[PDB]
Write an enzyme that holds these catalytic residues in place. Structure first.
Site, PDB file in Angstrom:
ATOM      1  N   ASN C  26      69.778  44.382  11.569  1.00 52.85           N
ATOM      2  CA  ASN C  26      69.830  42.822  11.805  1.00 52.85           C
ATOM      3  C   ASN C  26      70.856  42.454  10.530  1.00 52.85           C
ATOM      4  OD1 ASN C  26      69.646  40.316  10.011  1.00 52.85           O
ATOM      5  ND2 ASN C  26      67.504  40.119  11.212  1.00 52.85           N
ATOM      6  N   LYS C  60      74.957  35.522   7.402  1.00 52.75           N
ATOM      7  CA  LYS C  60      73.731  34.921   7.709  1.00 52.75           C
ATOM      8  C   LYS C  60      73.606  33.491   7.230  1.00 52.75           C
ATOM      9  CE  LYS C  60      71.119  36.158   9.461  1.00 52.75           C
ATOM     10  NZ  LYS C  60      72.122  36.290  10.530  1.00 52.75           N
ATOM     11  N   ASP C 238      61.451  38.447   6.560  1.00 47.74           N
ATOM     12  CA  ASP C 238      61.308  37.587   7.750  1.00 47.74           C
ATOM     13  C   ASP C 238      62.797  37.184   8.757  1.00 47.74           C
ATOM     14  OD1 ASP C 238      58.505  37.141   8.314  1.00 47.74           O
ATOM     15  OD2 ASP C 238      58.332  35.522   6.568  1.00 47.74           O
TER      16      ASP C 238
END
Lengths: 272, 272, 272, 272
Positions: C26, C60, C238
């Site tokens: 990620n 992010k 999450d």
């Protein structure tokens, strides 16, 4: 563009007329209870000035596990409505399930009712069409508003042309409902402008009942369907969600104030 | 963790076993047609090596406007399955609608079927529960996969414990369906791992049937439900969407190749 | 009807060609980790025979509360991809957020990426269009498959014609996703048959990853997007949901077996 | 339980106070037009007695194909609001897109605005948080009402605590919106009871605007967001759907009558 009128005795149900109230209880647990519920509505309606048609089920096909409370039964349920009619002089609306039940109930009651899960049941419809009695088609959660023409049509053919359409929300993902405030107009239109009513308690599978029923009214409706129980808490289970009796009046004052204000607006056209 | 097995005669339906095929036609238009349809499946199944259970409706409650084709009828429909059983020696699966029909059909057929709109019909379920025959519960489009436990339960109680669950998609907004490939596992789980099957043609209210049924198979299923017609085009109407007979074989080769490959994988755990 | 081919170096991405794998992590937590992750894919891909393009975010914008881990940064992230390219000789795919970042990254990487929330960001698109580099448009969850033509178009105009479309599921009610297996074909079609890929881990906001990615593959895709972590449990938070590294191989064997079988079928037409 | 108050100059926005109106136009086509639009609202608001905050975009990132009308521009847009402020003495609300734009606009305008697609853009939020100016967070269609706490939180941290939440409907299947009248309460609650407003024109991607905005009001809101155009027909395109200027007044009489009636009800508790 006038609204179709479907009369239930001295009651005239229509989208431009003042809203009727098809309040009541979920099932016919016992007359000692029915009578008490039906006693508070009448008193409140009569006092506030709102037409009214008590509602209650004498049967239940949507319960869980066979060893459960079916309900009074058609033969013992009809008997209960009798006593209420006399003692109170109000109209009774109940639902049916099988093609045969149709006529029996038609005699005993004013407004019969076609359940959602059976909305597309040609046989039960044609048989409900025979009676000639008033009909309330609950709108399935899995059907768009613009399809309610077929059900109204299939009823015309059966010879019946006295129908009300009831909305109870639409499927929104898994296990949830949302009421599209725009489907009311769509339903009026495709229904020859038949009367449209909102089943607020079903649309909520809470302290929410009020805000939602106000919204519904502000759109402008023929009626309002609801259910209440003396003690929602302890007698809470599932299916719908009843309103607390003791709050009937202050709640219905909200509706009238809305329904009257709105039902008396100069027709608006945001269309152009 | 073994899968529950529900056998239909010499046929064993289960989630880890090779997929069965519950193919057929929508309604029983005429035997001259039924026979021809049922003739191509058998030949193809038999040739390709796939279990099979012809399927067809002898009745229709979901049609539009009363002056329409109901269907052969229970009394004249059962007669048609007889001739097919003898002439072909294949099992017949049909749906029912009223509590009485249950037993009659149970004698004549192998796998009876509970329609979605009636899935929550306690009376018709209990009566279908009596027969003791195999059951196929079609999963309503308005019910989440994790709720299929109640229907399986209500059937256990009725004494019936031979049930298959059929998936046909879920409501996605107004007038549309989407198949959640994840609901299959959820259904296996809450169903004591009962057999789960995919109704591809219903899930499509096209040249799409193939891509969708491949997806379904790759998940790993007990079976596959489908319908076909010699000439879909001209005989096109609504409800489902049939597959073109002449494509049965090249289509089913796709499934087997998938169903066999997948049914033979070393159990995987992406869980940890 | 041939498929458009978008090549990333010696890699040719197309809907009929064998599926590529855009696996990875990620975010770029640390190189000691990146390297280890990127080490297992390569080894596995190389061993199994699947094209591959490592993927990781150096930034992010979708985190919660400002006092959080933004990420390495554009200036310190690019440096990390360098070392990986040399040490492993694999292509790098990363996402961007602001119009300026576009060019910088284009030099450092092979396949840049347009985030969903920004899919309709004309400025960032035009600027990403300049680079001329390959593009991966993630399909917003709130946009239907048949609208992906506009994004492909706006890119053609920007001079860029090397685009892949990535699907990650669609909104199904509140807080939930469902992957419509039928939107893949719709996307191919309106996209001049551009390459379509499935982002399985995003489509799952579990032990589910496998069944879902099989389904996806059986439809027939250009690629497969995924993410994994050595220890999903403890490092669970999450956004997406990573796959367990140690299961990469047995999982990817599933895909190939599917992707190869399917990519080699005689074109079928259930259309007629 | 009192409502949080977020004041825009001499204007106090709150859920129990009379509703404010954040009306206006979509984009700043030309001042000759802006001025005319902004001229009718003021006159109408002032005459009817409703607070008001003109709204208009000086930029567009959601258009189609680069060779299109971006908009006046930040440098030429701000200039237009100036003239309006003086000539009319009303507050201006506009949206932003990039982190830098924040401060510039904060000086020129009263209420800045965070677009939905960027709602989860930490950088642009923190930068919008700096200004200290009032904020209007449009609620993404793909986010449930109960998640608006995180955005309000991320703003508190940025030092900004003057936020309004705007609702514009939720995704209902492919290409469609439905407004959940129940999400308003959910949003009040998780937002420290921050002001909630309804963007009726966005929620309608018609002659529908009225019925929907009545519903919205009857729930009880802090405000109402809307857009109108002198000639909707000919200038019709896509994105929102404007109201017909000439109908502003008779439409807003509907709202007030609703907003006043409702804002003055004896708190009801259907909860018990």
């Amino acid at each position: 563009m006038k609204q179709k009128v479907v009369s239930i005795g001295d009651i005239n149900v229509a989208n431009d007329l003042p809203f009727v109230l098809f309040g009541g209880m979920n099932v016919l647990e016992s007359r000692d209870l029915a009578m008490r519920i039906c006693e508070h509505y009448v008193t409140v309606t009569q006092k506030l000035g709102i037409p009214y048609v008590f509602k209650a089920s004498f049967d239940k096909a949507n319960r869980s596990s066979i060893h459960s409370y079916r309900g009074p039964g058609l033969e013992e349920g009809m008997k209960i409505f009798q006593e209420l009619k006399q003692t109170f002089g109000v109209k009774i609306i109940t639902d049916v399930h099988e093609p045969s039940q149709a006529q029996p109930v038609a005699d005993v009651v004013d407004v019969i009712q076609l359940p959602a899960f059976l909305a597309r049941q040609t046989d039960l419809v044609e048989a409900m069409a025979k009676t000639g009695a008033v009909i309330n088609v609950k709108k399935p959660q899995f059907v768009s508003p613009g399809q309610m023409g077929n059900i109204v049509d299939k009823f015309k053919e059966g010879g019946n042309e006295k129908v009300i359409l009831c909305d109870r929300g639409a499927n929104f993902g898994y296990d949830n409902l949302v009421v599209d405030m725009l489907g009311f107009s769509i339903m009026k239109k495709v229904s020859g402008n038949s009367p449209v009513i909102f089943d607020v308690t079903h649309a909520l599978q809470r302290a929410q009942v009020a805000e939602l029923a106000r919204a519904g009214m502000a759109v402008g409706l023929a009626g309002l369907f609801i259910e209440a129980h003396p003690d929602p808490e302890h007698a809470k289970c599932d299916g719908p969600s009843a309103l607390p009796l003791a709050k009937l009046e202050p709640f219905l004052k909200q509706m009238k104030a809305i329904d009257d204000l709105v039902k008396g607006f100069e027709e608006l056209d945001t269309s152009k």
